[PDB]
Design an enzyme around this catalytic site. Structure first.
Site, PDB file in Angstrom:
ATOM      1  N   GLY A  58     -50.996  88.051  35.397  1.00  0.00           N
ATOM      2  CA  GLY A  58     -50.861  87.754  33.967  1.00  0.00           C
ATOM      3  C   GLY A  58     -50.927  88.959  33.045  1.00  0.00           C
ATOM      4  N   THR A  59     -50.781  88.712  31.743  1.00  0.00           N
ATOM      5  CA  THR A  59     -50.793  89.783  30.731  1.00  0.00           C
ATOM      6  C   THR A  59     -52.223  90.259  30.490  1.00  0.00           C
ATOM      7  OG1 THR A  59     -51.009  88.380  28.733  1.00  0.00           O
ATOM      8  CG2 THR A  59     -48.770  88.775  29.556  1.00  0.00           C
ATOM      9  N   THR A  60     -52.363  91.414  29.844  1.00  0.00           N
ATOM     10  CA  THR A  60     -53.681  92.007  29.592  1.00  0.00           C
ATOM     11  C   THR A  60     -54.378  91.315  28.421  1.00  0.00           C
ATOM     12  OG1 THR A  60     -52.743  94.166  30.257  1.00  0.00           O
ATOM     13  CG2 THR A  60     -54.980  94.160  29.308  1.00  0.00           C
ATOM     14  N   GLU A  84     -52.353  90.952  24.941  1.00  0.00           N
ATOM     15  CA  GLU A  84     -50.969  91.383  25.075  1.00  0.00           C
ATOM     16  C   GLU A  84     -50.098  90.133  25.239  1.00  0.00           C
ATOM     17  OE1 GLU A  84     -48.755  94.597  27.968  1.00  0.00           O
ATOM     18  OE2 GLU A  84     -49.979  93.107  28.999  1.00  0.00           O
ATOM     19  N   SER A 102     -56.118  85.428  30.771  1.00  0.00           N
ATOM     20  CA  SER A 102     -54.955  86.007  31.445  1.00  0.00           C
ATOM     21  C   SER A 102     -54.672  85.221  32.717  1.00  0.00           C
ATOM     22  CB  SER A 102     -55.232  87.458  31.827  1.00  0.00           C
ATOM     23  OG  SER A 102     -55.436  88.260  30.682  1.00  0.00           O
TER      24      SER A 102
END
Ligand code: GT5
Ligand code: CL
Ligand code: MG
Ligand code: MG
Ligand code: MG
Ligand code: MG
Lengths: 240, 244, 241, 243, 219, 204, 224, 196
Positions: D29-31, D46, D74
Site C-alpha cells: 500500500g501507499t505511505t 500519500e 496503508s
C-alpha cells in the site's frame, strides 16, 4: 467466528478403526502409571506425582480427585482433559442426580455419565476425544465397593484390580498374582505400593506418590473417600 | 475455512454404497459374536465378551446384553459407548409410548424408531454413524416372540435365528443347519452355545467369556419374564449342555 | 497431515498445534522470573525496546488483572492482551457473583480450563502465551501460579519463563537447595525485588539498567508495577553491596 | 507444509503465515505516517494519483472516530474502513455507558482485540492494513500503530506502507533532534516533508498530500483536516526541502 | 414461623421453632427449619416453605461445587450473594425469607435475606410471623460479644417468645451453634410444651369396620 | 373455580409397627355432580405407594409421569426405587412447575426394603415435603382427617389394628365432606405382603 | 408505558421575517415540587437549529444525547460537515419525528412535546412540532402544553397568518415571546421566572440567551 | 429515608440516617445506606432496598472492570453508569440515588438520580422521604466552599430535622467524608443530634 466444525473429526477408517480413539489411547499409554485395587472392605487408587519441576509445588497438582463423598477418581494421560472431566463429573452428580433424588449417584451411574461425556467427544462435531483413561473407585449402599475403568471411547469395565498408562502391562501381571477375594484394605494398599514401585524410576515416598481410598465412613453419613497424607504413605513404606 | 478437514460422512461411493456405514460394519465384524434364537416358547440371547482378563469383575459387568423395558432386551455388537447412547434413547421411547397409550410399546415400533435414528446419521448432519449392531429380543401381544437386528445403515429385519459381530458367516450356516421351527427354549439355549463354541476365536468357551439371557413367557400366569443370567448360572448351563 | 494444522491427535498421541503454540511463547525473546517473599510476591521481566520511535512507557508484558492479582505474559502481545482482558473480566465477574476477590490460583485454573478448550475444540486456536499469575492471597499467602497453551497449570515456590528459563530455574533451584525454605526470608518487598534482579543477573550473565527491567510486586491488598526510578533505586542498592 | 493455507494455524516455527501474508498487502500500500507533537498528534498520507480523472481533494483517506481520534491506514483500503466502522461502534458504546469520550489507549485496545480476533479462526481473513491512529484525551496526546496480527504500541512517530523505511529514518532524526518536543504546526510541516521524501518509493505516479491533526491548543483537542493556507504552507515547506 | 440468629463472641447462634402450618392447621409439629448450606454455614427458613427449602438446597449444591473447585471452605458473603441475586431476579415470587449464619476465614457473619433480594448484615436478626415477639427479647437483652451459653439462652428465649405469643409459631426449639472450632446442631434444644395426654382410648377393635372385598399379593 | 376442589376426594396414610397403611375414597365429581365411584387415588411403583388427591387430570398425569420416571430409574439403577428417594423425586418434579403447578396433594407410603423402616410423606402442590412419622392427610376433607387422625392415632399399631384406625379416620372424615366418599380403599402394606381392602360406606 | 416524573413545562416559539425565536423556562418540576431550578430545555444542534423540549426530563436527556450523537455521525466521512452537508432543521426534525412515532407504536413513548426551530440552507424559517404520539404540525406560532393555551393567543396577535411573517421584525417577535413568558409565569403553577431564549436568524445566525428573567411584574392591585 | 451529599472546600461528604421500615415496623434500625462503589466514589441509597442494593452491586462491578482496563473512573462516569441502569430499567425499579465522589482534578462532585433516571449535577443534594421537611432549611443554610467542620454540622443539623419529622427516617446519622486525605467514616447518635 463461525464454529464451522459441525462434522465429526473421529471417523471410521476402511479397516473399521476409529483413528482418533486409538491415538487417544496411545496418549494414555505415554501417561504416568496409575492403578486401582479393590478389597473386601474398601478400594484403593494410586498414581505417581510426576513433578514437572522441583520448584513446582506438586501438592497443588492433585491427580487423585474426589467426585462425590463416596467416589474418587485417578487417571493416566493428559492432565488438562482429566481436570475438565472431574469438573463435569462433579457437576453432573449434582444436576442430573442429587438435585433430583436428594442423594449422590452410585458409582456405576456416575461412571456411566462420565463415559457418556467421553463418548460425545468421540462423535460430536469439531472435537477430538479425551486423551485420558480414568480409574473411578467408589462405594454406594446397594452395590457396595466398586472399581471402574473408563477409556477415551466411552467404554467402561468394572475391575477387581487394574492399572493404566506407562507400565500397565507389567503392573496388571503383578496384580493378577497378588489379588484374591479375601484382601483387607490395608493388604490392598500394601500391594498398590508394591505394584507402583516397579513403574517409578526416581524418588519413591509420600511426596512423590498420591494415594487415596474408598473405605469406612470418616466422622447423615461421613465420607468414605479419603486421600492418604504424605506421612501415612511413608509409615506403610517402612512395612514394605 | 473448515471444508478442508471434512470427511463427508454422509455420501455415496460411485458404486452406490455409504462409505462410513460399510466401514462401521467392518468395525462391527471385529466385535464379539452375539446370537439370538427364537423358539415357540421363548427367545435366547447369547453373546461372547472380548479380550477379558482374570481381573475383570464379571458379575457387575455389562458390555453385551441390555434391558430396554420388561418385555424387550438387546444384544450389542460394536462400540459399547455408542450402543449405550442408543439404548438410553430406546428406553425413553418405550416409556413415552407407555405414557401416551397406557400400553407397552410393540417390539417393531421401538426397533423402527432406533433404526430411523441410525438412518438419520447416514443421510444428514455430517457426523459418523453409530458403530453398533443390535439383536432385539422382545415380546408383545400382537406378534408374540420377535427377533430383529439393526445395523449402522438403519436397516432392520426380522429373524428366527441370527448372529451379529464376528464370524457371522460361519455362525449363520451352523444355525441354518440345526434350527427347526418347532424348537424349544432349552434346545435353543444349547444351539446358541454350541454355535458360539465353534465360531469363537478363543481356545475354549468358558463362563467368564459369556453373557447370556432368556425371554420366557414360561412364568406363572402367562406373563413375560426376562432373565439376565448370572456368572454362576452361565457356568451351570455350560456344564448341562456338555461344553465344559 | 492435517493432524498438524488443527487440534486433533497425531498417531503418536500428540497435539502439534499445542506444541507449536509453546514455540510462539519464546517469539518475544524475553525472560521472566517470579519469587515469593514473606509478605510479598515479586515478578520481574526483561524489557526490550528495540525501536527508538516506540513510547517505552507503553511497552509492557505485565498486567494488573485485579487489585490483588498481577499477571506477566511470556508470548506475543496480541495474545497476551487477549488473555489479560479475559482474566480481568473473569476476576470482575467473580467478585460480583461470589462477593470476594478472586484468588490467584482460582483465576489460574479458570484461564487454564479456557486454554484446555482451545486444545479440544478445532475452530479455536490455542493462545501462544504462558501466563504467570502472582498475588498475596488472603488464605494461601504469597502465590505464584502459571498457565500454558496445553491448559496445564500449577503453583510455584518460584518460577522462570522464556528462552533462558532453564538457566534461571537452575539458579533459583540451587538457592532454595541452600536456604531449605519455599521463599525469600525477607521483610521488605524492596529487598525481595533486589534478590529477584540479582539472581536474574547471575543466571543470564547480563547487567541491567533501569530501562532494561520491568518489575511487578504483589503485597496484601494490592499489586503494583515499579517505575523506572523505583527500579533505579533497586539497582543502586544491588551495586552498593 | 500447508500451514500457510489456513488462517489461525501455527506453523512449526510458531508463526501464523496468513497474518504475515496480510503484512505483504500492507507493505504493498501507499505511505501513511503519524507524528506525536507537544500537545497532540499529526497524521498524513500519500494518495497516488492513478489518473488525471481523479477529482482533487475528494477521495479522502484519513477517517475521524468520535470527535477526537484520527485514523489513517496503508494497504487494503476497504479493510481499513471496516476497522474504523468498528472503532466508531466501540467509541460510541464506551461514551454511551461511561459519558466521557473514549481514551486513546482504551480505544487502541478495542481495535487491537478485534484485529486479534481475526487471527483466531480459519473462517475469517486477517486485516490487510496497518492502522496509524491517535488523538488527545484527558492524559494528553497519544499516537498508536496497529498491525494485522493485533499488535500495537505507543509511538513518538509511526510509519507504514511502501515508503515506511524512508519515513522511519526521517522520524528517527526528529526524535533525536527534538528531545524537548515538536510543536503542532512544526509537526504538520514535518509530516508533509516526510510524505514527500517517502514518495521516492512510489515515484512513478505523482501524488496528493493529505494531512490531519488533533492538538490541544491548535484544534481544541478535536480532529480536524489541514486545509487551505496551512496545507499549502506545509506543501511549500515540503517542496523546498526536497529541492 | 419464628427464626432468629445472633453473633456472639466466638461465632453464630441460629434458632428456629418447629411448627409447619397449612392455613390454620398444623401439618407437622416437629419440622426442620434450619438448613445446611455448607459445613460452616447454615440457614434458617421462613416464608413459603417450598421456596425456603429449594432455594437453600440449590445454593448449597452450587456452593459445594464452588468449594470443590476452589478447594477451600465457602464464605457467608458468597452464600448471601447467590441467594440474594437469585431472589432478586424472581422479584419476590420466590417467597424465601432467610436468616443466614456462618463462620468464615474472615470470622462470623449473620445476614437476613428477604424475598425481594434485599439483605441486611447484622449482629442479631429475627424473621417469620414471630419476628416481633423474638425481636422484643433481643432488644430487651442483647449485648455484643456474648459468651456461648449466654447467646444460646438469648436465642432460645427469643424463639420461645415467638412460640407462645405467635400462633404461626410453635413446637420445639432448634438451635445451631457455629464457631471456628465446632458446629453444634441441637435438635431439639428445648421442648417447652409437653404433648397433650389423651384420657381415653378411641381406637376401634378388630372387625369393627365393614369390608366388601379383600386381596393379598406377596412381594 | 378452585382447582383443588372441583373433583374432590381424599387420601390418608399412617405408620404402624413394621407396616404402613394408605387409604383413599373413590369419588370423582364435577363439583355437585357425582360422575365416577371407581376413581382410585392410590398407585404404586414397585413397593412404594403414592396417593394423589386434587384435580383429577393432574392426578392421572402425575401417576403416568411417576410410572415413567420410576421405570427408567429401575432400568438404570437395576433396583426398585425406595420411599425416601421417591419422596425427593416427587418434590423435585412438583417444584419444577413452581409457577404453573399441578393442583395435587400427593402422599408417599412404603417400607424401605433394606432398612425395613416404615415411611410416609406428604407434599403441598409445589413440592414442600411434610415429613411426619405419625400420619399424612390430603384432599377436600383434610381438616376432617387431621381431627380424626389426631384423636384416633397412636404409634406402633399392628397391621389389623392400624386398618381399623385408618379406615375409621377415612370413613368418618369423608361423611362430613360433600365431595368425598362414594366408596373407599385401604392398603395395608408390610415388608413382603400387601392387603388391599374395599370398604362399605354410605353412598351419598 | 411509563409516567413522566421530572417534567418541563411550556416551550414557546414563533417565526419572524428573517428567522425563528424559541424560548423555555429553566425548571424541572417533580410533581408539585419545584425541584430543579437550573435545567436547560433548549438544546442547539449545530449553528442553525434549536430543539426545545417539554415533558419528561429523563426522556429529554435521552433525546439530547441522540442529537449530540447525530452531529458526531454526520461528521463521519463528510468533508462538508461544516458546510453543504451540515445538519438541517428539517433533517433533525424528521429524525426526531420518526423516533417519536416509532416509540409510540411500540407502546413505549418518549414522554415529550418537542419544537424544532431553525433556519434552512436557503434561508427558509423552519418551525415544527412533534409529541409522544408522533403527531406533527407547523404554524407561524407553536407552543407546547400550557403555552398552547396562553402564549399562542398572544403570539398569534403578532403573526395571525403566513402573510404577517415578513412584516414582523426580530425586536417585535422577541418582545412578544418575552411578554408571553411573563404571562405564563403569572398563570402556570409549574413554571419559573428564569428562562432561556434562542433566536435563529438567517443573517446574524444563532443567538442563545441564558439566565433571562420575567420582570415588569404587576402585583400592586393585590393589596386592595 | 433521609440522605444527602454536600460538596465543600476539601471535597465532599455523604450523609444518611439508618432506619429501614416495613410499614410501621423498623426492620433494621442500624442500616448502612452509604455504599461504596469505588475507593472515593460512594452513593446514598433511597427507594427499594432490593433495587438499590442490586444496582449498587452492578455499578461496583462495572467500575471495578473499568478500573482494570482504564484506571480510576471519574465521579461523572460512576453517575452515568447508575443513570443508565436506572433510566433503562425505570419501569421495574424504585431507586432514588445520590452519587458522590472525590477526584483530585475535579475535587468534590455530587450527582442526584431521582425516580425518572434523569441526572442532575449539584453543589449539594438531598433525597428520600425525610428530605421534603428540610428543603427550606438546607436552602437557607447551605454555602459553597464550607470547611469540613461546617459541612459536618450542616449535614448533622439537616438530617436531625429530617429524622425529627419523618417517621420513615431515624436511628444514627452516618456520614462518609471524601477528601484527598482519604475516606473517613463518622457516626452521630440520637443523644447528640436530638438536642441540637
Ligand atoms: C413458617 C413461615 S411463616 C407463617 O411466614 O412465619 C413456616 C416455615 C417453614 C420452613 C421450612 C419448613 C420445612 N421445609 C416448613 C415450614 N412456613 C409454613 O408453615 C408455610 C406457610 O407460611 C406462610 N406453609 C407452607 O408452605 C405449606 C406447606 C407445608 C404445610 C408442607 N403450604 C401451604 O399451606 C400452601 C397452600 N397453598 C400453597 C401454594 S402453599
Ligand atoms: Cl472453569
Ligand atoms: Mg484448536
Ligand atoms: Mg360424604
Ligand atoms: Mg352425593
Ligand atoms: Mg423519626
Amino acid at each position: 467466528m463461525t464454529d464451522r466444525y459441525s462434522f465429526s473429526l473421529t471417523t471410521f477408517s476402511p479397516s473399521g478403526k476409529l483413528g482418533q480413539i486409538d491415538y487417544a489411547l496411545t496418549a494414555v499409554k505415554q501417561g504416568v502409571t496409575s492403578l486401582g485395587i479393590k478389597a473386601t472392605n474398601g478400594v484403593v487408587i494410586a498414581t505417581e506425582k510426576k513433578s514437572s519441576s522441583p520448584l513446582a509445588m506438586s501438592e497443588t497438582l492433585s491427580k487423585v480427585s474426589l467426585l462425590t463423598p463416596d467416589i474418587g477418581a485417578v487417571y493416566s494421560g493428559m492432565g488438562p482433559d482429566y481436570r475438565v472431566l472431574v469438573d463435569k463429573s462433579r457437576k453432573v452428580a449434582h444436576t442430573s442426580y442429587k438435585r433430583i433424588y436428594g442423594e449422590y449417584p452410585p458409582t456405576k451411574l456416575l461412571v456411566s455419565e462420565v463415559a457418556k461425556i467421553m463418548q460425545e467427544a468421540t462423535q460430536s462435531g469439531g472435537v477430538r476425544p479425551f486423551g485420558v483413561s480414568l480409574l473411578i473407585a467408589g462405594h454406594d449402599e446397594f452395590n457396595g465397593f466398586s472399581l471402574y475403568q473408563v477409556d477415551p471411547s466411552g467404554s467402561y469395565f468394572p475391575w477387581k484390580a487394574t492399572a493404566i498408562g506407562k507400565g500397565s502391562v507389567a503392573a496388571k501381571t503383578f496384580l493378577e498374582k497378588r489379588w484374591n477375594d479375601e484382601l483387607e484394605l490395608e493388604d490392598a494398599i500394601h500391594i498398590a505400593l508394591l505394584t507402583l514401585k516397579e513403574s517409578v524410576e526416581g524418588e519413591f515416598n509420600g511426596d512423590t506418590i498420591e494415594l487415596a481410598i474408598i473405605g469406612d465412613e470418616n466422622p447423615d453419613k461421613g465420607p468414605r473417600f479419603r486421600k492418604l497424607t504424605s506421612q501415612e504413605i511413608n509409615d506403610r513404606l517402612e512395612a514394605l | 475455512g473448515s471444508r478442508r478437514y471434512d470427511s463427508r460422512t454422509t455420501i455415496f461411493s460411485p458404486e452406490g454404497r455409504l462409505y462410513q456405514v460399510e466401514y462401521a460394519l467392518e468395525s462391527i465384524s471385529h466385535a464379539g459374536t452375539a446370537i439370538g434364537i427364537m423358539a415357540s416358547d421363548g427367545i435366547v440371547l447369547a453373546a461372547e465378551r472380548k479380550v477379558t482378563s482374570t481381573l475383570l469383575e464379571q458379575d457387575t459387568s455389562t458390555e453385551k446384553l441390555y434391558k430396554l423395558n420388561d418385555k424387550i432386551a438387546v444384544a450389542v455388537a460394536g462400540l459399547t459407548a455408542d450402543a449405550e447412547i442408543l439404548i438410553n434413547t430406546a428406553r425413553i421411547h418405550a416409556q413415552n409410548y407407555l405414557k401416551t397409550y397406557n400400553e407397552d410399546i410393540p417390539v417393531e415400533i421401538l426397533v423402527r424408531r432406533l433404526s430411523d435414528i441410525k438412518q438419520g446419521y447416514t443421510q444428514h448432519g455430517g457426523l459418523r454413524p453409530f458403530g453398533v449392531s443390535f439383536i432385539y429380543a422382545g415380546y408383545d401381544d400382537r406378534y408374540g416372540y420377535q427377533l430383529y437386528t439393526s445395523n449402522p445403515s438403519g436397516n432392520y429385519t426380522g429373524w428366527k435365528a441370527i448372529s451379529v459381530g464376528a464370524n457371522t458367516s460361519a455362525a449363520q450356516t451352523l444355525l441354518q443347519m440345526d434350527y427347526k421351527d418347532d424348537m424349544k427354549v432349552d434346545d435353543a439355549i444349547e444351539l446358541a452355545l454350541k454355535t458360539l463354541s465353534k465360531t469363537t476365536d478363543s481356545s475354549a468357551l468358558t463362563y467368564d467369556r459369556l453373557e447370556f439371557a432368556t425371554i420366557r413367557k414360561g412364568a406363572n400366569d402367562g406373563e413375560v419374564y426376562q432373565k439376565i443370567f448370572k456368572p454362576q448360572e452361565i457356568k451351570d448351563i455350560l456344564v448341562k449342555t456338555g461344553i465344559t | 497431515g492435517y493432524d498438524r494444522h488443527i487440534t486433533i491427535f497425531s498417531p503418536e498421541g500428540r497435539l502439534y498445534q499445542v506444541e507449536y503454540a509453546f514455540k510462539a511463547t519464546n517469539q518475544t525473546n524475553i525472560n521472566s522470573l517470579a519469587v515469593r517473599g514473606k509478605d510479598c510476591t515479586v515478578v520481574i521481566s526483561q524489557k526490550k525496546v528495540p525501536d527508538k520511535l516506540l513510547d517505552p512507557t507503553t511497552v509492557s508484558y505485565i498486567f494488573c488483572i485485579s487489585r490483588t492479582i498481577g499477571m506477566v505474559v511470556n508470548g506475543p502481545i496480541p495474545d497476551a492482551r487477549n488473555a489479560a482482558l479475559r482474566a480481568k473480566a473473569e476476576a470482575a465477574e467473580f467478585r460480583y457473583k461470589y462477593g470476594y476477590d478472586m484468588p490467584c490460583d482460582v483465576l489460574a485454573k479458570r484461564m487454564a480450563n479456557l486454554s484446555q478448550i482451545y486444545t479440544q475444540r478445532a475452530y479455536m486456536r490455542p493462545l501462544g502465551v504462558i501466563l504467570t499469575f502472582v498475588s498475596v492471597d488472603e488464605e494461601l499467602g504469597p502465590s505464584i501460579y502459571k498457565t500454558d497453551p496445553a491448559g496445564y497449570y500449577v503453583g510455584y515456590k518460584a518460577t522462570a519463563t522464556g528462552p533462558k528459563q532453564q538457566e534461571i530455574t537452575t539458579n533459583l533451584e540451587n538457592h532454595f537447595k541452600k536456604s531449605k525454605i519455599d521463599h525469600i526470608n525477607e521483610e521488605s518487598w524492596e529487598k525481595v525485588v533486589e534478590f529477584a534482579i540479582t539472581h536474574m543477573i547471575d543466571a543470564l550473565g547480563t547487567e541491567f539498567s533501569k530501562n532494561d527491567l520491568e518489575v511487578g510486586v504483589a503485597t496484601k491488598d494490592k499489586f503494583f508495577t515499579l517505575s523506572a526510578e523505583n527500579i533505579e533505586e533497586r539497582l543502586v542498592a544491588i551495586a552498593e553491596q | 507444509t500447508g500451514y500457510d493455507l489456513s488462517n489461525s494455524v501455527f506453523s512449526p516455527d510458531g508463526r501464523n503465515f496468513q497474518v504475515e501474508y496480510a503484512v505483504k498487502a500492507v507493505e504493498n500500500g501507499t505511505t501513511s505516517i503519524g507524528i506525536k507533537c507537544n500537545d497532540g498528534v499529526v497524521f498524513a498520507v500519500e494518495k497516488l494519483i492513478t489518473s488525471k480523472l481523479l477529482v482533487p481533494q475528494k477521495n479522502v483517506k484519513i477517517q475521524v472516530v468520535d470527535r477526537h481520534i484520527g485514523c489513517v491506514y496503508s494497504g487494503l483500503i476497504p479493510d481499513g474502513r471496516h476497522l474504523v466502522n468498528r472503532g466508531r461502534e466501540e467509541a460510541a458504546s464506551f461514551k454511551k455507558l461511561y459519558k466521557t469520550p473514549i481514551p486513546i489507549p482504551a480505544f487502541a485496545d478495542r481495535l487491537g482485540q478485534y484485529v486479534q480476533a481475526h487471527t483466531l479462526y480459519n473462517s475469517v481473513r486477517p486485516f490487510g492494513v496497518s492502522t496509524i491512529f491517535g488523538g488527545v484525551d484527558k492524559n494528553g496526546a497519544h499516537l498508536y500503530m496497529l498491525e494485522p496480527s493485533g499488535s500495537y504500541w505507543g509511538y513518538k512517530g509511526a510509519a507504514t506502507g511502501k515508503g515506511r523505511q524512508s519515513a522511519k529514518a526521517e522520524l528517527e532524526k526528529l526524535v533525536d533532534h527534538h528531545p524537548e518536543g515538536l510543536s503542532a504546526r512544526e509537526a504538520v510541516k514535518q509530516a508533509a516533508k516526510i510524505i514527500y521524501l517517502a514518495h521516492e518509493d512510489n515515484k512513478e505516479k505523482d501524488f496528493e498530500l493529505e494531512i490531519s491533526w488533533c492538538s490541544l491548543s491548535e484544534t481544541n483537542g478535536l480532529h480536524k483536516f489541514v486545509k487551505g493556507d496551512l496545507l499549502q504552507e506545509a506543501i511549500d515547506f515540503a517542496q523546498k526541502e526536497i529541492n | 414461623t419464628t427464626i432468629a440468629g445472633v453473633v456472639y463472641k466466638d461465632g453464630i447462634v441460629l434458632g428456629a421453632d418447629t411448627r409447619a402450618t397449612e392455613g390454620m392447621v398444623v401439618a407437622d409439629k416437629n419440622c426442620s427449619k434450619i438448613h445446611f448450606i455448607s459445613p460452616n454455614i447454615y440457614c434458617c427458613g421462613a416464608g413459603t416453605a417450598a421456596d425456603t427449602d429449594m432455594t437453600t438446597q440449590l445454593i448449597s449444591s452450587n456452593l459445594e461445587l464452588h468449594s470443590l473447585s476452589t478447594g477451600r471452605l465457602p464464605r457467608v458473603v458468597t452464600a448471601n450473594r447467590m441467594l440474594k441475586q437469585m431472589l432478586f431476579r424472581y422479584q419476590g415470587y420466590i417467597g424465601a425469607a432467610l436468616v443466614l449464619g456462618g463462620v468464615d476465614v474472615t470470622g462470623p457473619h449473620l445476614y437476613s435475606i428477604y424475598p425481594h433480594g434485599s439483605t441486611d448484615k447484622l449482629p442479631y436478626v429475627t424473621m417469620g410471623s414471630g419476628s416481633l415477639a423474638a425481636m422484643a427479647v433481643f432488644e430487651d437483652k442483647f449485648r455484643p460479644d456474648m459468651e456461648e451459653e449466654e447467646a444460646k439462652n438469648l436465642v432460645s428465649e427469643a424463639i420461645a417468645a415467638g412460640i407462645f405469643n405467635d400462633l404461626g409459631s410453635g413446637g420445639n426449639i432448634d438451635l445451631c451453634v457455629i464457631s471456628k472450632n465446632k458446629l453444634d446442631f441441637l435438635r431439639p434444644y428445648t421442648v417447652p410444651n409437653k404433648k397433650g395426654t389423651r384420657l381415653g382410648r378411641y381406637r376401634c377393635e378388630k372387625g369393627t369396620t365393614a369390608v366388601l372385598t379383600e386381596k393379598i399379593t406377596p412381594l | 373455580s378452585d382447582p383443588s376442589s372441583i373433583n374432590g376426594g381424599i387420601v390418608v396414610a399412617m405408620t404402624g409397627k413394621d407396616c404402613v397403611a394408605i387409604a383413599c375414597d373413590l369419588r370423582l365429581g364435577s363439583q355437585s355432580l357425582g360422575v365416577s365411584n371407581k376413581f382410585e387415588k392410590i398407585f404404586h411403583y414397585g413397593h412404594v405407594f403414592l396417593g394423589i388427591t386434587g384435580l383429577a387430570t393432574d392426578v392421572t398425569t402425575l401417576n403416568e409421569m411417576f410410572r415413567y420416571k420410576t421405570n427408567l430409574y429401575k432400568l438404570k439403577e437395576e433396583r426398585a426405587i425406595e420411599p425416601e428417594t421417591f419422596t425427593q423425586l416427587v418434590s423435585s418434579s412438583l417444584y419444577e412447575r413452581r409457577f404453573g403447578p399441578y393442583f395435587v396433594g400427593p402422599v408417599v407410603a412404603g417400607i424401605n426394603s433394606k432398612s425395613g423402616k416404615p415411611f410416609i410423606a406428604g407434599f403441598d402442590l409445589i413440592g414442600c415435603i411434610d415429613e411426619a412419622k405419625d400420619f399424612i392427610v390430603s384432599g377436600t376433607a383434610s381438616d376432617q382427617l387431621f381431627g380424626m387422625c389426631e384423636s384416633l392415632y397412636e404409634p406402633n399399631l399392628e397391621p389389623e389394628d392400624l386398618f381399623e384406625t385408618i379406615s375409621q379416620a377415612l370413613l368418618n372424615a369423608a361423611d362430613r365432606d360433600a365431595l368425598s366418599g362414594w366408596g373407599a380403599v385401604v392398603y395395608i402394606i408390610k415388608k413382603d405382603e400387601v392387603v388391599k381392602r374395599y370398604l362399605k360406606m354410605r353412598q351419598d | 408505558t411509563q409516567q413522566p416524573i421530572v417534567t418541563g413545562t411550556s416551550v414557546i416559539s414563533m417565526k419572524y421575517d428573517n428567522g425563528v425565536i424559541i424560548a423555555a423556562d429553566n425548571l424541572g418540576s417533580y410533581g408539585s415540587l419545584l425541584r430543579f431550578n437550573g435545567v436547560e430545555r433548549l438544546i442547539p444542534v449545530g449553528d442553525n437549529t434549536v430543539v426545545g423540549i417539554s415533558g419528561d426530563i429523563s426522556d429529554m436527556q435521552h433525546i439530547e444525547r441522540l442529537l449530540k450523537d447525530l452531529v458526531t455521525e454526520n461528521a463521519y466521512d463528510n468533508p462538508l460537515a461544516d458546510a453543504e452537508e451540515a445538519l438541517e432543521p428539517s433533517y433533525i426534525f424528521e429524525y426526531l419525528a420518526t423516533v417519536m412515532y416509532q416509540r409510540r407504536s411500540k407502546m413505549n413513548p418518549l414522554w415529550n412535546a418537542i419544537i424544532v426551530a431553525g433556519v434552512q440552507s436557503n434561508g427558509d424559517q423552519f418551525l415544527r412540532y412533534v409529541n409522544l404520539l408522533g403527531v406533527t404540525y407547523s404554524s407561524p406560532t407553536l407552543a407546547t402544553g400550557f403555552g398552547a393555551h396562553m402564549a399562542n393567543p398572544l403570539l398569534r396577535k403578532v403573526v395571525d397568518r403566513e402573510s404577517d411573517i415578513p412584516k414582523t421584525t426580530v425586536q417585535v417577535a422577541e418582545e412578544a415571546i418575552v411578554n408571553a413568558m411573563r404571562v405564563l409565569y403569572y398563570r402556570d403553577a409549574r413554571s419559573s421566572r428564569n428562562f432561556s431564549l434562542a433566536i435563529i436568524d438567517k443573517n446574524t445566525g444563532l443567538t442563545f440567551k441564558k439566565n433571562l428573567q420575567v420582570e415588569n411584574m404587576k402585583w400592586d392591585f393585590a393589596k386592595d | 429515608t433521609s440522605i444527602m451529599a454536600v460538596t465543600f472546600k476539601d471535597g465532599v461528604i455523604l450523609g444518611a440516617d439508618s432506619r429501614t421500615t416495613t410499614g410501621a415496623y423498623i426492620a433494621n434500625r442500624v442500616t448502612d445506606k452509604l455504599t461504596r462503589v469505588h475507593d472515593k466514589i460512594w452513593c446514598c441509597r433511597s427507594g427499594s432496598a432490593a433495587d438499590t442494593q442490586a444496582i449498587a452491586d452492578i455499578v461496583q462491578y462495572h467500575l471495578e472492570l473499568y478500573t482494570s482496563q482504564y484506571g480510576t473512573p471519574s465521579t461523572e462516569t460512576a453517575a452515568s453508569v447508575f443513570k443508565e441502569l436506572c433510566y433503562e430499567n425505570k419501569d421495574n425499579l424504585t431507586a432514588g440515588i445520590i452519587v458522590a465522589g472525590y477526584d483530585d482534578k475535579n475535587k468534590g462532585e455530587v450527582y442526584t438520580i431521582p425516580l425518572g433516571g434523569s441526572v442532575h449535577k449539584l453543589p449539594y443534594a438531598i433525597a428520600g422521604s425525610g428530605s421534603t421537611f428540610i428543603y427550606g432549611y438546607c436552602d437557607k443554610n447551605f454555602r459553597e466552599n464550607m470547611s469540613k467542620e461546617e459541612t459536618v454540622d450542616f449535614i448533622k443539623h439537616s438530617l436531625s430535622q429530617a429524622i425529627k419529622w419523618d417517621g420513615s427516617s431515624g436511628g444514627v446519622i452516618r456520614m462518609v467524608v471524601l477528601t484527598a486525605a482519604g475516606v473517613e467514616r463518622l457516626i452521630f447518635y440520637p443523644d447528640e443530634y436530638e438536642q441540637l
